[PDB]
Amino acid sequence: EVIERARRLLRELADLAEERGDEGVAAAAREVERLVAERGDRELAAVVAALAAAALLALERGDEVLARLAAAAAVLVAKRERGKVAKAVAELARLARLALERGDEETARLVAEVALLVASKGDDELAEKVAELAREARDALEAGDRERAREAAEEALRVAREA
Amino acid sequence: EVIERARRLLRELADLAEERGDEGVAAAAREVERLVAERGDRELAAVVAALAAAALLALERGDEVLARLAAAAAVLVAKRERGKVAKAVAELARLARLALERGDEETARLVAEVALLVASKGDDELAEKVAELAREARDALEAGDRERAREAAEEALRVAREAE
């Protein structure tokens, strides 16, 4: 019942994402839903259900930041990503929050995308390259260099995109 | 390291929630962090870290509903609750989603708190009472009776807070 509950929430997330044009989270939802099925884990399914609910609620509002990080978390949890990719996505999450409090919606949106791609592709080399870019963006934000922060975030998106 | 990673996220969640006045969420974070430490379970720490990050980002965004629901999830996972309390939190979460979609943000907020309290206390009896009040609030929502929906959620909150 938990497994079906989670899978139901992922299908609504995939549906809503496709309707909104957010192919990234729709792809993630579809991959996560498969992972939830194969693992057959009650506890894992519950956790994915919460994250999927968060993403679904965020995307209904239009909050790509919350939608994509909640999606990225679901991909991390479903894939059981416990390593360099997991730490990278955490840094991107740490950075996105920093951007939000700094009134920097632009980088926060960009960083949110990077986290979802890094979670999806799960390549350790990409994880470190992006983690390197994320730290530079973090110092830029902490210093008030909003411009250099965005540039580092845009680089992170391109390197993730090409991967 | 995951375990300390989780515990750090729970402490900031407790701090920020305390600063926002959402003592319900702060109390949950402190209880969950104690469980994460005592259990010393890497896998539990990883998933709880995910929820704590979700809740923490939710409060940064301003969405108390999402913050409290993510906290309620973390409490359920940490406490390993798969009974009447678990089903209640699920029903309450769906009710919060319905309230938000129906443009009744207040009831969604109240209902979100109820879910966190029901998760924390883990009373099967409280779970059942709240389940009845939740259905009344849902039916009110489906009809467009926001006032009775709010009233039923407020009743659920009052029963959840006082239950020990």
Secondary structure (H, E, C), A57-87: HHHHHCCHHHHHHHHHHHHHHHHCCCCHHHH
Chain B nearest-CA distance from A66, in A, is 7
Residue type, A25: V
Measured distance CA(B142)–CA(A10) in Å, rounded = 24
Measured distance CA(A16)–CA(B158) in Å, rounded = 35
Measured distance CA(A33)–CA(B99) in Å, rounded = 26
Q: What is the dihedral of CA B80, B127, B145, A9, to 10 degrees?
A: 20
Pull the structure tokens for residue B104.
């009744």
Measured distance CA(B53)–CA(B8) in Å, rounded = 10
Measured distance CA(A69)–CA(B119) in Å, rounded = 24
Three-state helix/strand/coil letters over chain A:
CHHHHHHHHHHHHHHHHHHHCCHHHHHHHHHHHHHHHHHCCHHHHHHHHHHHHHHHHHHHHCCHHHHHHHHHHHHHHHHCCCCHHHHHHHHHHHHHHHHHHCCCHHHHHHHHHHHHHHHHHCCHHHHHHHHHHHHHHHHHHHHCCHHHHHHHHHHHHHHHHHC
- Yes or no, beta carbons of B60 and A90 under 8 Å apart: no
Nearest to B56 by CA among A79, A45, A16, A65: A65
- Could you count the other beta carbons within 10 Å of the beta carbon of residue A121? 13
Chain A nearest-CA distance from B54, in A, is 6
Measured distance CA(B118)–CA(B123) in Å, rounded = 7
Chain A nearest-CA distance from B47, in A, is 6
Residues from chain B contacting residue A57 (CB–CB below 8 Å): 63, 65-66, 97, 100
- Yes or no, beta carbons of B50 and A47 under 8 Å apart: yes
Nearest to B132 by CA among B100, B73, B88, B163: B88
User: Which residues does A contribute to its contact with B (CB < 8 Å)?
Assistant: 2, 5, 42-44, 46-47, 49-51, 53-54, 56-58, 60, 63, 65-66, 69-70, 73, 76-77, 82, 86, 90, 93, 96-97, 100-101
The single residue listed with the structure tokens 């005592």 is: B38
Alpha-carbon distances, residue A61 vs A135, B60, B101 (angstroms): 30, 16, 9
Radius of gyration of chain A (CA): 15
The tally of CA atoms less than 13 A away on the side-chain side of residue A82 is 11
Q: Which contiguous run of DSSP H or E holds residue B158?
A: helix B146-162
- Evaluate whether A63 touches A98 at the Cβ level (below 8 Å): no
Q: Which contiguous run of DSSP H or E holds residue B39?
A: helix B23-39
- Evaluate whether A58 touches A70 at the Cβ level (below 8 Å): yes
User: Which experimental technique did the depositors report for determining this structure?
Assistant: X-ray
- Beta strands, E only, A18-152: none
- Could you count the other beta carbons within 10 Å of the beta carbon of residue A63? 23
Buried/exposed code over A124-142 (b: 16+ C-beta within 10 A; e: otherwise)? eebbebbbebbebbbebbe
Q: For chain A, give every domain's residue range.
A: 1-80, 82-163
Pull the structure tokens for residue A3.
């497994």
Measured distance CA(A156)–CA(A135) in Å, rounded = 11
Q: How many residues does chain B have?
A: 164
Residue type, B4: E
Measured distance CA(B132)–CA(B19) in Å, rounded = 33
